[PDB]
Amino acid sequence: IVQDEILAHRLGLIPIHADPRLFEYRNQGDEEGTEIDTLQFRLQVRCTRN
Amino acid sequence: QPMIYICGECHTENEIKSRDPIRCRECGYRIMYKKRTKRLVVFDAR
Amino acid sequence: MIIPVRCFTCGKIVGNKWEAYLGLLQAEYTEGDALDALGLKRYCCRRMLLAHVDLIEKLLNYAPL
Amino acid sequence: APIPTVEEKWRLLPAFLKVKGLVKQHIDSFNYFINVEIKKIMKANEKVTSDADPMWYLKYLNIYVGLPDVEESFNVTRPVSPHECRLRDMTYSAPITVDIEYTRGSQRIIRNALPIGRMPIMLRSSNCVLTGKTPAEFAKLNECPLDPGGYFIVKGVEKVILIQEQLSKNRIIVEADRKGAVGASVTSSTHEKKSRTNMAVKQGRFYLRHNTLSEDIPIVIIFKAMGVESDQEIVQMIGTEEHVMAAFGPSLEECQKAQIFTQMQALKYIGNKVRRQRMWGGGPKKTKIEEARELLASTILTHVPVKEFNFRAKCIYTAVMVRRVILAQGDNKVDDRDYYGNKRLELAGQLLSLLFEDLFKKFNSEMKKIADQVIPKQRAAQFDVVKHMRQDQITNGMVNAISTGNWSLKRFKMDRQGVTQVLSRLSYISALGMMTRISSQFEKTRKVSGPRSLQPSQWGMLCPSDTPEGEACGLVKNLALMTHITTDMEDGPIVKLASNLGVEDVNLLCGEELSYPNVFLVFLNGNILGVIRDHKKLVNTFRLMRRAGYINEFVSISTNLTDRCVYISSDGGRLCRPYIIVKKQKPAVTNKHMEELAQGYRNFEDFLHESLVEYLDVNEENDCNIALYEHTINKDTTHLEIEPFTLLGVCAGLIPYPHHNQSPRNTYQCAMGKQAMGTIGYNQRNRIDTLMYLLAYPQKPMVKTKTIELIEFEKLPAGQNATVAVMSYSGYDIEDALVLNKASLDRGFGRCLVYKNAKCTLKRYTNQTFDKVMGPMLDAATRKPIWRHEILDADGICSPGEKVENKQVLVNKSMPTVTQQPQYKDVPITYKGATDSYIEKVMISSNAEDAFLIKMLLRQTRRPEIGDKFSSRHGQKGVCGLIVPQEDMPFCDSGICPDIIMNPHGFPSRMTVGKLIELLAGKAGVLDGRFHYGTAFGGSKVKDVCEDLVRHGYNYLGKDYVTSGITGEPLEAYIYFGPVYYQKLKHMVLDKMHARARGPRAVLTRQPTEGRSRDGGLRLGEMERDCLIGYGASMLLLERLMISSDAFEVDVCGQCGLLGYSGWCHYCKSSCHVSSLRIPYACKLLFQELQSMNIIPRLKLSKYN
Amino acid sequence: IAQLRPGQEIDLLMHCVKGIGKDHAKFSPVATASYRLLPDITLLEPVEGE
Amino acid sequence: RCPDCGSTELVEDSHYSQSQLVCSDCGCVVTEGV
RNA sequence: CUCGCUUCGG
Ligand SMILES: Nc1ncnc2c1ncn2[C@@H]1O[C@H](COP(=O)(O)OP(=O)(O)OP(=O)(O)O)C[C@H]1O
Ligand SMILES: [Zn+2]
Ligand SMILES: [Zn+2]
Ligand SMILES: [Zn+2]
């Protein structure tokens, strides 16, 4: 029910325990991202009856 | 080509082809929404 | 619709303190002492939790399912 | 020794709202109309027959409306929820069926259930499916439990029939004319005829004017015509005061100048002064005296009845009217129209009753005409009505009248417009307040004076603050929180009690008794019920009987001592309000009664029956003495106010501490809050509307009025509480502007969602060819859909979840051009939009006409920015002038940085102390975890919140020590910090921003189009041209009005002076004198129009030198 | 993060990149970073009694 | 066909509420205004 | 598209 943009905004506000000093600023563009300057989090929840 | 829809109360996957009167099996309800797309969508946290 | 993750003014994480707050209301606690026990000192987070309406379950009652 | 106070007295208000109040007006009126009134109308028109072929008839037996159903299924009905009617763009109606008996071939044939029409069904009415349902059942039906209901659904749109306000009928009105002459008027209206008859004093003598008379005639002649012939009796009826005879003498002299002395002579005079109604077909012996007598008996003063050509009562009525005119001709006691004791409210029920009566009469007339055309000529195959009873007549009439909103009743000569309006779904408060609106009989069409004013009669009945700010200020009004509209009564027991109470019959005495100082006339709905002495006993007995229950509690009795008239009102539409009865300085309501009410022993009806609370009409409350509070009760007090804050309406109930503000601020807040952004209902996700505004994280207000609790506004909030600090910052908040915090907006403050609708139809035409949607046109180069068709699914309809850009197709619609192979031309539904939008859902339905209805719900997520309008629940509408970073914001010792910085300068001019008190109360409440109340004429006092603040360690006045965010140094002055309930308005800069290139032009005059929706350009009005002229800028004026708008080059013949084409003059058949000339296109259109009007403009050209 | 009902599903991936709170408030590390001057209340004359 | 370069790549592309049939190769505006 | 009607905004 939560809209996609609202869900993304909520996910952005969640703090991440990763140490920022170990990464670098992502370059302008480069939406793919590399190992140095990004992290990936998978969220997969399927609700079903008990 | 299987075109799939979801009725408003059964919420069951119904495959209907072109020029079919809009209905649903195991119901008679006639509001037939379309399923969400499979293409990836990118959103900005801003 | 749903409890905001962050407090609007200060920015303290308030999203994770919602359901537990309800537990304190499911218990005998008043509003003020429950907010004190949750650790909301400045009044902005107290306004965040106190004035929030949980519309998500009422909307989910109208969800397809 | 202060008088004891019943603290729980306010608890009477919710109990009342359990049975009446906000929305129950329309619902009760519609239930009465569909359960009682329709049967009365059918009984009035039960038998229809034709003059040709007697012994043939069609008789109606019983009528039913049934439950709402849909005719989609082939000759089969199916129960339908209102939300389904909303989605399918169909009407939410129920089948009007009737059982009849008629004669086919002189053999009686009866039908027990024969459909004839469809009634659009008001939501939450008796027949509506939503009534008597639980919130879980509401969820199963996809309807919000908090929806007010009371509105019709026609063709998918929600229409509300506004409550009409009009002057009461059959009442004497003494008024001044344009020339200052004090005349009289009465609009005698019965169930059949409305006629306004006037009395004038134009030459010191009284004439009676009516539309059926060629010329106004002296009143004495009319008196002689109506049976009374002696002049002395007429003078006795007028009055025995000396000045009355002095004033009425000239009329007697004028009568005596003519030789009119008998009833026959006056009847002959009137018949001479009679005008034939356009050669009325059929002549009953050169009628004249009979015409005059019929006009006197029927047409003139219709509401006054003549038993059998006995004009005694009508004589008394006109004598009373003459006496009132004479008395008002001295002391200028001219009655005012704006007094709401003379006003009546028509709900949806009465309007629908009139419409159904007209439609049923038309249906019966059509049936009779068909019978006349068919029966006497056809065959031994006997004509029967069932083969001719068209069922679309009533249904189409109802649907068109409700949808378009224009009502044309030829039987009543009533042409009304704007009866129904589209229900506004901007917010819950918007719909709730629109549900209780009242429209005026006069329109903002002109600058009137008086109705627009706030009359004191609106007390307790209508909201004083709630009125639309603009051209319709004062002409659209809102009902108060605790009010009731009366219905019609039987009028029988009132007459019986009045006769038994000593009221002498008027026919038994001469008119001289009317002039006695102690004799009081008693009326009843404009009819003289009689005369009485010692009217105090009669009034007290009538009120006591009404309290006892033998008389209906809505029957009103009032006394006018100046005119010495006791008025008894029993007609419907009058405004009433409950009041606590006070007997000898002690209220009938005690603490024990309120305790029983709280415990559930008794309800409001029990209070009504036990003579504790009684309804007061405006006319009746004119004679009563009402005390606002217990301490105000004195010896001469007859009633007690239940709750003062019920004076305000529904929208004005949102204002915290409204009594601390200036009234224009309250009016602005009512208007603003009608437009507040917020949640609509629990089914706002399944609902698909043309435009919907939602708030991401709505919050209930910290300072809530009891009206908010009563209407359950906190369940559907329409705003957010922001930590407002009142200070001047950066000079970006000069005039009503406010500064927003960038971090707050980044954390979801003010985040809003805009839902728009895009609907398409695929209809099958008369020829067996239909609209079809192609699949996406794949690009052969890349084997992928082209950029325009990027979002389309395999079926040619855009799939939910993707984002749409400008000039992209949502539905790949292609339609035939024939109506031999079909030829399809493309008319795809493109998305016109400045910004990207996301498709949330796509709904596909099929109507009975095989028309495929497709609706896409596009969603946009908008963040507050520069230009977004913000309100503060106190009429302090503002624009976000600057968005500063969080670190630049000032901070307190605790580290709190404000979300909104509002300029202090807005306070002194507007004196909105209520905002300051609300801020203080909200700060105290959030500190101690409470919800303070800003109830009108009450609420939490300043002292208590100050004590709470000092107890919590903050300053007792909200002002806090603050360090500047920029310089890092403390501010010299303490800053006023606190949570304020700010609400975002629908007015956004993104929607309002407009820019115009060359763009399109209009065909008639080649100038840019009008509106933003049509990509129109801005307009240089007449005053802009005047300002440019005043500047003297000739070249810029020429460039703006000629070069940049409608420049054109025409060919003018220098010989004939007319317009040629392509360097050739057809008139002169030559091309030597044709010269090109620059000109505005509108001027060329004007010249051609003038030529068509035979006003030939001939242009004599010359060289520019 | 969100609330679901049976049948509903949330499947997504999140790319996290380094950023400063000036660009967006979601990057701010501190809930509240503030300072106040140390008070020093002084008594001009000796106060005794109630 | 485009009157300038002779191509047949005539695309109907509306640019900010201005209907416009334009060559897709050289950008020559063939027709404009409705 | 034209036209009218309403509701807004100011
Ligand atoms: N019908 C109208 N004609 C011309 N200008 C208008 C009209 N309605 C609004 N405006 C514009 O709005 C401005 C009216 O504001 P003004 O009357 O001075 O303050 P206000 O609306 O009384 O606010 P307060 O109630 O004093 O807070 C001035 C004018 O340019
Ligand atoms: Zn189904
Ligand atoms: Zn906070
Ligand atoms: Zn010529």
PDB file of C-alpha atoms in Angstrom, chain D residues 344-496:
ATOM      1  CA  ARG D 344     -37.615  29.161   4.817  1.00  0.00           C
ATOM      2  CA  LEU D 345     -35.178  26.427   3.804  1.00  0.00           C
ATOM      3  CA  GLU D 346     -35.974  23.938   1.048  1.00  0.00           C
ATOM      4  CA  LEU D 347     -34.009  20.702   1.416  1.00  0.00           C
ATOM      5  CA  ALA D 348     -33.489  18.008  -1.218  1.00  0.00           C
ATOM      6  CA  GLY D 349     -36.805  16.352  -0.342  1.00  0.00           C
ATOM      7  CA  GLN D 350     -39.089  19.225  -1.335  1.00  0.00           C
ATOM      8  CA  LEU D 351     -37.185  19.904  -4.562  1.00  0.00           C
ATOM      9  CA  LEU D 352     -37.274  16.219  -5.510  1.00  0.00           C
ATOM     10  CA  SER D 353     -40.993  16.134  -4.678  1.00  0.00           C
ATOM     11  CA  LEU D 354     -41.672  19.034  -7.044  1.00  0.00           C
ATOM     12  CA  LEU D 355     -39.515  17.466  -9.763  1.00  0.00           C
ATOM     13  CA  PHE D 356     -41.176  14.060  -9.437  1.00  0.00           C
ATOM     14  CA  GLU D 357     -44.647  15.625  -9.470  1.00  0.00           C
ATOM     15  CA  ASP D 358     -43.790  17.480 -12.686  1.00  0.00           C
ATOM     16  CA  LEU D 359     -42.254  14.384 -14.300  1.00  0.00           C
ATOM     17  CA  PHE D 360     -45.163  12.132 -13.299  1.00  0.00           C
ATOM     18  CA  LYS D 361     -47.668  14.668 -14.637  1.00  0.00           C
ATOM     19  CA  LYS D 362     -45.742  14.814 -17.920  1.00  0.00           C
ATOM     20  CA  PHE D 363     -45.660  11.002 -18.068  1.00  0.00           C
ATOM     21  CA  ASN D 364     -49.420  10.755 -17.481  1.00  0.00           C
ATOM     22  CA  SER D 365     -50.087  13.471 -20.077  1.00  0.00           C
ATOM     23  CA  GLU D 366     -47.936  11.630 -22.626  1.00  0.00           C
ATOM     24  CA  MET D 367     -49.784   8.387 -21.857  1.00  0.00           C
ATOM     25  CA  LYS D 368     -53.162  10.091 -22.288  1.00  0.00           C
ATOM     26  CA  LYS D 369     -52.069  11.666 -25.584  1.00  0.00           C
ATOM     27  CA  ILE D 370     -50.834   8.291 -26.862  1.00  0.00           C
ATOM     28  CA  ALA D 371     -54.170   6.772 -25.845  1.00  0.00           C
ATOM     29  CA  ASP D 372     -56.030   9.481 -27.759  1.00  0.00           C
ATOM     30  CA  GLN D 373     -53.860   8.948 -30.842  1.00  0.00           C
ATOM     31  CA  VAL D 374     -54.049   5.126 -30.810  1.00  0.00           C
ATOM     32  CA  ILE D 375     -57.352   3.869 -29.366  1.00  0.00           C
ATOM     33  CA  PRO D 376     -60.037   5.236 -31.749  1.00  0.00           C
ATOM     34  CA  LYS D 377     -58.502   4.262 -35.115  1.00  0.00           C
ATOM     35  CA  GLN D 378     -56.213   1.223 -34.962  1.00  0.00           C
ATOM     36  CA  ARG D 379     -57.874  -2.199 -35.013  1.00  0.00           C
ATOM     37  CA  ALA D 380     -59.694  -4.801 -32.961  1.00  0.00           C
ATOM     38  CA  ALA D 381     -56.230  -5.223 -31.424  1.00  0.00           C
ATOM     39  CA  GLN D 382     -57.155  -3.172 -28.374  1.00  0.00           C
ATOM     40  CA  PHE D 383     -54.677  -0.505 -27.305  1.00  0.00           C
ATOM     41  CA  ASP D 384     -53.017  -1.153 -23.945  1.00  0.00           C
ATOM     42  CA  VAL D 385     -50.695   1.255 -22.147  1.00  0.00           C
ATOM     43  CA  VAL D 386     -48.060  -1.369 -21.276  1.00  0.00           C
ATOM     44  CA  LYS D 387     -46.837  -1.377 -24.885  1.00  0.00           C
ATOM     45  CA  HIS D 388     -46.335   2.407 -24.669  1.00  0.00           C
ATOM     46  CA  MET D 389     -45.182   3.142 -21.088  1.00  0.00           C
ATOM     47  CA  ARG D 390     -41.705   4.427 -21.902  1.00  0.00           C
ATOM     48  CA  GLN D 391     -39.484   4.039 -18.837  1.00  0.00           C
ATOM     49  CA  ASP D 392     -36.679   6.430 -19.821  1.00  0.00           C
ATOM     50  CA  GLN D 393     -38.841   9.533 -19.235  1.00  0.00           C
ATOM     51  CA  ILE D 394     -38.647   9.665 -15.426  1.00  0.00           C
ATOM     52  CA  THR D 395     -35.102   8.277 -15.290  1.00  0.00           C
ATOM     53  CA  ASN D 396     -33.714  10.717 -17.861  1.00  0.00           C
ATOM     54  CA  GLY D 397     -35.520  13.639 -16.235  1.00  0.00           C
ATOM     55  CA  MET D 398     -34.136  12.824 -12.796  1.00  0.00           C
ATOM     56  CA  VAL D 399     -30.604  12.184 -14.073  1.00  0.00           C
ATOM     57  CA  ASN D 400     -30.472  15.341 -16.197  1.00  0.00           C
ATOM     58  CA  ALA D 401     -31.955  17.548 -13.469  1.00  0.00           C
ATOM     59  CA  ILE D 402     -29.555  16.273 -10.801  1.00  0.00           C
ATOM     60  CA  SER D 403     -26.475  16.281 -13.054  1.00  0.00           C
ATOM     61  CA  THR D 404     -26.886  19.579 -14.906  1.00  0.00           C
ATOM     62  CA  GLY D 405     -28.405  21.258 -11.849  1.00  0.00           C
ATOM     63  CA  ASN D 406     -30.919  23.350 -13.823  1.00  0.00           C
ATOM     64  CA  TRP D 407     -34.583  22.798 -12.948  1.00  0.00           C
ATOM     65  CA  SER D 408     -37.335  23.899 -15.347  1.00  0.00           C
ATOM     66  CA  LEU D 409     -40.860  23.346 -13.999  1.00  0.00           C
ATOM     67  CA  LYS D 410     -43.392  24.744 -16.469  1.00  0.00           C
ATOM     68  CA  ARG D 411     -46.275  23.757 -14.181  1.00  0.00           C
ATOM     69  CA  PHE D 412     -44.777  26.149 -11.594  1.00  0.00           C
ATOM     70  CA  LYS D 413     -42.935  28.469 -14.029  1.00  0.00           C
ATOM     71  CA  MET D 414     -39.807  27.855 -11.940  1.00  0.00           C
ATOM     72  CA  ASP D 415     -36.436  28.224 -13.700  1.00  0.00           C
ATOM     73  CA  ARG D 416     -33.692  27.502 -11.165  1.00  0.00           C
ATOM     74  CA  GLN D 417     -29.979  27.061 -11.836  1.00  0.00           C
ATOM     75  CA  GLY D 418     -27.078  25.819  -9.748  1.00  0.00           C
ATOM     76  CA  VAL D 419     -29.311  23.653  -7.562  1.00  0.00           C
ATOM     77  CA  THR D 420     -26.722  20.854  -7.468  1.00  0.00           C
ATOM     78  CA  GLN D 421     -22.947  21.169  -7.165  1.00  0.00           C
ATOM     79  CA  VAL D 422     -20.001  18.802  -7.496  1.00  0.00           C
ATOM     80  CA  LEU D 423     -18.984  17.542  -4.063  1.00  0.00           C
ATOM     81  CA  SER D 424     -15.501  18.848  -3.268  1.00  0.00           C
ATOM     82  CA  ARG D 425     -13.074  16.119  -2.173  1.00  0.00           C
ATOM     83  CA  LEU D 426     -10.129  18.372  -1.321  1.00  0.00           C
ATOM     84  CA  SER D 427     -10.329  17.171   2.294  1.00  0.00           C
ATOM     85  CA  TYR D 428     -12.713  15.619   4.792  1.00  0.00           C
ATOM     86  CA  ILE D 429     -13.521  19.087   6.151  1.00  0.00           C
ATOM     87  CA  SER D 430     -14.199  20.290   2.601  1.00  0.00           C
ATOM     88  CA  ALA D 431     -16.870  17.652   1.975  1.00  0.00           C
ATOM     89  CA  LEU D 432     -18.326  17.928   5.484  1.00  0.00           C
ATOM     90  CA  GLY D 433     -18.687  21.705   5.276  1.00  0.00           C
ATOM     91  CA  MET D 434     -20.045  21.596   1.733  1.00  0.00           C
ATOM     92  CA  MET D 435     -22.641  19.097   2.976  1.00  0.00           C
ATOM     93  CA  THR D 436     -24.128  21.789   5.266  1.00  0.00           C
ATOM     94  CA  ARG D 437     -24.165  24.713   2.824  1.00  0.00           C
ATOM     95  CA  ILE D 438     -27.095  27.033   2.113  1.00  0.00           C
ATOM     96  CA  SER D 439     -27.525  29.010  -1.112  1.00  0.00           C
ATOM     97  CA  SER D 440     -29.409  32.304  -1.294  1.00  0.00           C
ATOM     98  CA  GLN D 441     -32.324  33.164  -3.568  1.00  0.00           C
ATOM     99  CA  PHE D 442     -30.426  36.267  -4.769  1.00  0.00           C
ATOM    100  CA  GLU D 443     -27.031  35.682  -6.486  1.00  0.00           C
ATOM    101  CA  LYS D 444     -23.602  37.435  -6.523  1.00  0.00           C
ATOM    102  CA  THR D 445     -24.913  38.690  -9.912  1.00  0.00           C
ATOM    103  CA  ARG D 446     -25.130  42.178  -8.349  1.00  0.00           C
ATOM    104  CA  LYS D 447     -23.969  44.378  -5.474  1.00  0.00           C
ATOM    105  CA  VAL D 448     -26.965  43.947  -3.126  1.00  0.00           C
ATOM    106  CA  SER D 449     -26.953  45.262   0.494  1.00  0.00           C
ATOM    107  CA  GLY D 450     -28.657  43.678   3.547  1.00  0.00           C
ATOM    108  CA  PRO D 451     -28.678  39.906   2.785  1.00  0.00           C
ATOM    109  CA  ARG D 452     -24.886  40.167   2.395  1.00  0.00           C
ATOM    110  CA  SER D 453     -24.801  41.679   5.874  1.00  0.00           C
ATOM    111  CA  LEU D 454     -24.699  39.506   8.995  1.00  0.00           C
ATOM    112  CA  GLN D 455     -28.116  39.950  10.560  1.00  0.00           C
ATOM    113  CA  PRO D 456     -28.486  39.229  14.298  1.00  0.00           C
ATOM    114  CA  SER D 457     -31.216  36.710  13.414  1.00  0.00           C
ATOM    115  CA  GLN D 458     -28.482  34.244  12.373  1.00  0.00           C
ATOM    116  CA  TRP D 459     -27.764  33.559  16.061  1.00  0.00           C
ATOM    117  CA  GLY D 460     -27.504  29.842  16.787  1.00  0.00           C
ATOM    118  CA  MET D 461     -28.815  28.982  13.318  1.00  0.00           C
ATOM    119  CA  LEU D 462     -26.035  29.890  10.862  1.00  0.00           C
ATOM    120  CA  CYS D 463     -22.278  30.145  11.266  1.00  0.00           C
ATOM    121  CA  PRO D 464     -21.247  33.826  11.462  1.00  0.00           C
ATOM    122  CA  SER D 465     -17.634  33.352  10.373  1.00  0.00           C
ATOM    123  CA  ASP D 466     -18.029  30.732   7.627  1.00  0.00           C
ATOM    124  CA  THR D 467     -18.735  32.523   4.338  1.00  0.00           C
ATOM    125  CA  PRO D 468     -16.904  32.319   0.977  1.00  0.00           C
ATOM    126  CA  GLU D 469     -14.320  35.090   0.707  1.00  0.00           C
ATOM    127  CA  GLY D 470     -14.931  36.750  -2.651  1.00  0.00           C
ATOM    128  CA  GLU D 471     -17.843  37.750  -4.874  1.00  0.00           C
ATOM    129  CA  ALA D 472     -20.251  35.410  -3.040  1.00  0.00           C
ATOM    130  CA  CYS D 473     -19.440  36.826   0.412  1.00  0.00           C
ATOM    131  CA  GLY D 474     -22.602  36.593   2.506  1.00  0.00           C
ATOM    132  CA  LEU D 475     -24.742  34.889  -0.153  1.00  0.00           C
ATOM    133  CA  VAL D 476     -23.520  31.355   0.679  1.00  0.00           C
ATOM    134  CA  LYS D 477     -23.918  30.393   4.323  1.00  0.00           C
ATOM    135  CA  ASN D 478     -23.271  27.428   6.613  1.00  0.00           C
ATOM    136  CA  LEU D 479     -25.542  25.898   9.234  1.00  0.00           C
ATOM    137  CA  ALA D 480     -24.515  26.055  12.875  1.00  0.00           C
ATOM    138  CA  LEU D 481     -23.384  22.910  14.668  1.00  0.00           C
ATOM    139  CA  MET D 482     -26.613  22.482  16.678  1.00  0.00           C
ATOM    140  CA  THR D 483     -29.562  23.322  14.432  1.00  0.00           C
ATOM    141  CA  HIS D 484     -32.628  21.598  13.008  1.00  0.00           C
ATOM    142  CA  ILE D 485     -34.914  22.246  10.031  1.00  0.00           C
ATOM    143  CA  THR D 486     -38.598  21.554  10.642  1.00  0.00           C
ATOM    144  CA  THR D 487     -40.852  19.571   8.328  1.00  0.00           C
ATOM    145  CA  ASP D 488     -44.537  20.111   7.589  1.00  0.00           C
ATOM    146  CA  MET D 489     -47.204  19.252  10.163  1.00  0.00           C
ATOM    147  CA  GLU D 490     -50.826  18.170   9.796  1.00  0.00           C
ATOM    148  CA  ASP D 491     -52.194  21.585  10.950  1.00  0.00           C
ATOM    149  CA  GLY D 492     -55.390  20.011  12.350  1.00  0.00           C
ATOM    150  CA  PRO D 493     -54.871  19.806  16.117  1.00  0.00           C
ATOM    151  CA  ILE D 494     -53.444  23.340  16.056  1.00  0.00           C
ATOM    152  CA  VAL D 495     -56.760  24.652  14.715  1.00  0.00           C
ATOM    153  CA  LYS D 496     -58.698  22.466  17.157  1.00  0.00           C
TER     154      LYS D 496
END
